[PDB]
């Protein structure tokens, strides 16, 4: 039932509000939570989680980074990027490195849930 996520993010009040939001919609159970990029990719590999939601700059490795390797693994899991910066360039590497999505930092606590939920589902 519930949809799985990873959410990896290294400013602590950005991750916590992320995981109140998903918990809160009832449709969402938060596995696992990163401070750091290489970290992320671990808890990716051991709960396989059908959404990873990952900060694009996360310390150690960033999000276009694990989003290569989560596809060169073939693991199961669509990982959706959520920055501050959205350069055309950006955006644009990161979903040739394999990223499922790329948000905002200025989305809404509905918008998140959906975009993880839509993810999930599919795009």
Same mark, same amino acid.
């Given at each position: 039932?519930?949809?799985?996520?990873?959410?990896?993010?290294?400013?602590?009040?950005?991750?916590?509000?992320?995981?109140?939001?998903? *918990?809160?919609?009832?449709?969402?159970?938060? #596995?696992?939570? /990163?401070?750091?990029?290489? @970290? %992320?990719?671990? =808890?990716? +590999?051991?709960?396989?989680?059908?959404?990873?939601?990952?900060?694009?700059?996360?310390?150690?490795?960033?999000?276009?980074?694990?989003?290569?390797?989560?596809?060169?693994?073939?693991?199961?899991?669509?990982?959706?990027?959520? *920055?501050?910066?959205?350069?055309?360039?950006? #955006?644009?590497? /990161?979903?040739?490195?394999? @990223? %499922?999505?790329? =948000?905002? +930092?200025?989305?809404?606590?509905?918008?998140?849930?959906?975009?993880?939920?839509?993810?999930?589902?599919?795009?």
């Amino acid at each position: 039932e519930k949809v799985r996520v990873v959410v990896g993010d290294d400013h602590p009040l950005f991750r916590e509000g992320v995981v109140r939001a998903l *918990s809160l919609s009832g449709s969402v159970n938060v #596995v696992g939570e /990163a401070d750091d990029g290489a @970290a %992320a990719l671990e =808890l990716i +590999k051991a709960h396989l989680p059908d959404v990873a939601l990952l900060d694009y700059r996360m310390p150690g490795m960033d999000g276009a980074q694990v989003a290569a390797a989560v596809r060169s693994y073939e693991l199961p899991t669509r990982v959706l990027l959520i *920055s501050a910066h959205d350069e055309p360039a950006i #955006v644009y590497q /990161a979903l040739q490195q394999g @990223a %499922a999505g790329f =948000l905002l +930092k200025d989305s809404t606590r509905t918008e998140i849930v959906k975009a993880v939920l839509d993810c999930a589902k599919g795009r």
